[PDB]
Amino acid sequence: FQPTNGVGYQPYRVVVLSFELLHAPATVCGPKKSTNLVKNKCVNFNFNG
Amino acid sequence: CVNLTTRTQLPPAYTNSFTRGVYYPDKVFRSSVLHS
């Protein structure tokens, strides 16, 4: 590569993020904030995804 | 490292595994089911 090459020969860096959705303990997470746990009531829940 | 050479050379022995070697294949709780 030289700076003035055509877009065909221009470098495109890549950082593929291979997200693993297998069933197991989950450590990497979204920035969402947690709320208090509510029991014995109809709720919309999100437990670690 | 030190190479230990004072060892008798006999052929391998064999035995019967019976029903050992079964493990939990996954990390999900299930009960009163048969899973293939």
Side-chain angles (χ1 to χ4, degrees), chain A residues 1-22 24-49, chain B:
Chain A
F1 302 169
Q2 63 85 30
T4 67
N5 294 115
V7 176
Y9 302 170
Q10 282 184 347
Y12 274 57
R13 266 183 191 163
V14 167
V15 181
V16 291
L17 294 178
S18 180
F19 303 100
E20 282 204 326
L21 277 182
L22 188 65
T27 69
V28 188
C29 282
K32 203 174 278 322
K33 71 165 292 184
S34 69
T35 71
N36 293 328
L37 181 66
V38 178
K39 290 179 273 187
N40 304 317
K41 190 186 297 194
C42 181
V43 300
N44 293 305
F45 57 83
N46 184 327
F47 288 99
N48 205 24
Chain B
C1 293
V2 176
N3 284 5
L4 305 179
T5 63
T6 303
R7 292 185 287 175
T8 299
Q9 304 299 304
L10 302 182
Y14 295 71
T15 191
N16 196 313
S17 67
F18 292 168
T19 57
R20 296 273 161 179
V22 176
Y23 61 89
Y24 287 80
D26 53 80
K27 303 292 183 63
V28 303
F29 177 88
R30 52 176 61 119
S31 62
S32 298
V33 297
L34 301 181
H35 183 71
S36 174

